[PDB]
Amino acid sequence: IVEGSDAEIGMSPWQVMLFRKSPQELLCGASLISDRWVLTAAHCLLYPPWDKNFTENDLLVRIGKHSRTRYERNIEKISMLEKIYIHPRYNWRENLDRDIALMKLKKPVAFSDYIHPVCLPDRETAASLLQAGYKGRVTGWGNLKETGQPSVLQVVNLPIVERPVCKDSTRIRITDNMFCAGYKPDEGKRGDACEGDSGGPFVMKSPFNNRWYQMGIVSWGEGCDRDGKYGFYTHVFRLKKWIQKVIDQFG
């Protein structure tokens, strides 16, 4: 995260770290949506242009973390993966359309002060809150700058951007399964996701019921925190039928 700040303890208890077993390293962010299911970006797991195609046994999920590099004894919980599910129409060839994946854990994780699921949006909460200017919150352990790395989880709040401005910022084809967020050059304030933040959540706190909802997944961008560029996020609500189908069938 560029131009964010250190998270408070327990600020993002749905935060998940995707951790490579060998070499031991950060692979991506992710989020906890129930005691057995973790949501992330498909490109965290499958991206053939970079020879990336992880299997279940390659990875662990680390839940309840705050420190990036420490083993947080008595706080974090480490889970193995039973199965990965990638959206069947994830477009890794072109523009990362439908950049979403689920991971089922081998055993349920115990909730605690540090470990708790985020809500997924209903249609009405999505319609109400996915508006230009409305801010969400992005969290992760990724790089602090495009060109270094944080001691603890970082957080930044960023406004959703009007779709024509998102489209006009890039040559990549934008779809209804994406939205963009970030400040405009004339707005002064800054901030973005960066390398290592992929797959983590863009959340909003509903003013109606005072619950946190995951509206987006960190998906893609061009550089990090560049003027006139915006971060792109997977539109979770638009892909919720697939999420529900997987959980109903395999949960």
């Binding site: 700040s5 408070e8 303890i9 327990g10 600020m11 208890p13 949506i33 129930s34 005691d35 605690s112 002060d113 540090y114 708790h116 699921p117 985020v118 809500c119 997924l120 809150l129 200017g133 409305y134 801010k135 969400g136 919150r137 957080v155 709040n157 406004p159 909003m204 706190k205 509903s206 003013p207 005072n210 619950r211 946190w212 909802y213």
Partner: peptide, 28 residues
């Protein structure tokens, strides 16, 4: 889940985090 999105160290204790008000102020 029934209890989703309510953080043990914040909403469940009626404590506010340091920047959530920035989000609320944007929901205009």
């Amino acid at each position: 889940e029934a209890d989703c999105g309510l953080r043990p160290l914040f909403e469940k204790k009626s404590l506010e985090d340091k920047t959530e008000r920035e989000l609320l102020e944007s929901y205009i």
